[PDB]
Write an enzyme that holds these catalytic residues in place. Structure first.
Site, PDB file in Angstrom:
ATOM      1  CG  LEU A  55      -1.912  -1.253   1.111  1.00  0.00           C
ATOM      2  CD1 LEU A  55      -2.377  -1.809   2.434  1.00  0.00           C
ATOM      3  CD2 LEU A  55      -3.146  -0.748   0.359  1.00  0.00           C
TER       4      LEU A  55
ATOM      5  CD  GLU B 194      -8.688   0.347   5.495  1.00  0.00           C
ATOM      6  OE1 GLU B 194      -9.887   0.214   5.373  1.00  0.00           O
ATOM      7  OE2 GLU B 194      -7.955  -0.461   4.924  1.00  0.00           O
TER       8      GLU B 194
END
Ligand SMILES: NC(=O)C1=CN([C@@H]2O[C@H](COP(=O)(O)OP(=O)(O)OC[C@H]3O[C@@H](n4cnc5c(N)ncnc54)[C@H](OP(=O)(O)O)[C@@H]3O)[C@@H](O)[C@H]2O)C=CC1
Ligand SMILES: CN(Cc1cnc2nc(N)nc(N)c2n1)c1ccc(C(=O)N[C@@H](CCC(=O)O)C(=O)O)cc1
EC number: 1.5.1.3
Length: 186
Positions: free
Chosen positions: A22, A30
């Site tokens: 990411l 998250e």
């Protein structure tokens, strides 16, 4: 076979990945929500199915592979057999969904969750039918190399709310984000 859903976390610049991982620091809440959403089954004895391309499968830390409590499926035209740890391999998103119709799986699976990546989102996203997109809007720009296709707002509506999804801005490690849900039916 219940619901067909997509789930993604995107930055202000519409970007989901950078060199296999990411673009952002790991947000554990998250990830928490990601896991909670994809794993929870509204039907006893039934499970959720996760559909991911081969580069997404390879970006999940080894140790967390295959994602637990979930039936894991990889998508690929190259591989002959599911990568070690995977449960199924399909050559298409249409094939993967048909398998859902097989009696093998037809009584084991509740909802199916599409976890990416792009190419995969893009096609599902345009799949005839009723669909929902659970989007985490990471509120800043992160240099990325892979993107989320655009949401066609003329087809996809943002809900004012949704049960089990926080409506207020989250912020962790100084990175703020919000959870959203779009719904479709066409
Ligand atoms: N923020 C977020 O929500 C998410 C971020 N990510 C991150 O982004 C990247 C994932 O990127 P992306 O490049 O899109 O990779 P994918 O994970 O989609 O990998 C693509 C591979 O998957 C196969 N494939 C994909 N779509 C299909 C299809 N419809 N039919 C058949 N095969 C298909 C192909 O395999 P072959 O070549 O075998 O045919 C293709 O090379 C990583 O950086 C990952 O960490 C990933 C998911 C969500
Ligand atoms: C690279 N990546 C893909 C990823 C990451 N964040 C996302 N976030 C959202 N909202 N949607 C996605 N589809 C998504 N995909 C990953 C990486 C690790 C794990 C993971 O290890 N997941 C655990 C959660 C473990 C944890 O709580 O930290 C699980 O049990 O599902 C999942 C996805």
């Amino acid at each position: 076979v219940g619901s067909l859903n997509c789930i993604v976390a995107v930055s202000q610049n519409m970007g989901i990945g950078k060199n296999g991982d990411l673009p952002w620091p790991p947000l554990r809440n998250e990830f928490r929500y990601f896991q909670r959403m994809t794993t929870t089954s509204s039907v006893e004895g039934k499970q959720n199915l996760v559909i991911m391309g081969k580069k997404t499968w390879f970006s999940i830390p080894e140790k967390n592979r295959p994602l637990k409590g979930r039936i894991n499926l990889v998508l690929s035209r190259e591989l002959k057999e599911p990568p070690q740890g995977a449960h199924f391999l399909s050559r298409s998103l249409d094939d993967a969904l048909k398998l859902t119709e097989q009696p093998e799986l037809a009584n084991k699976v509740d909802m199916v969750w599409i976890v990416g990546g792009s190419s995969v989102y893009k096609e599902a996203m345009n799949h005839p039918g009723h669909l929902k997109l659970f989007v985490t809007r990471i509120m800043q720009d992160f240099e990325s190399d892979t993107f989320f296709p655009e949401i066609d707002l003329e087809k996809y509506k943002l809900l004012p709310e949704y049960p089990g999804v926080l409506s207020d801005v989250q912020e962790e490690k100084g990175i703020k984000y919000k959870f959203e849900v779009y719904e479709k039916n066409d």
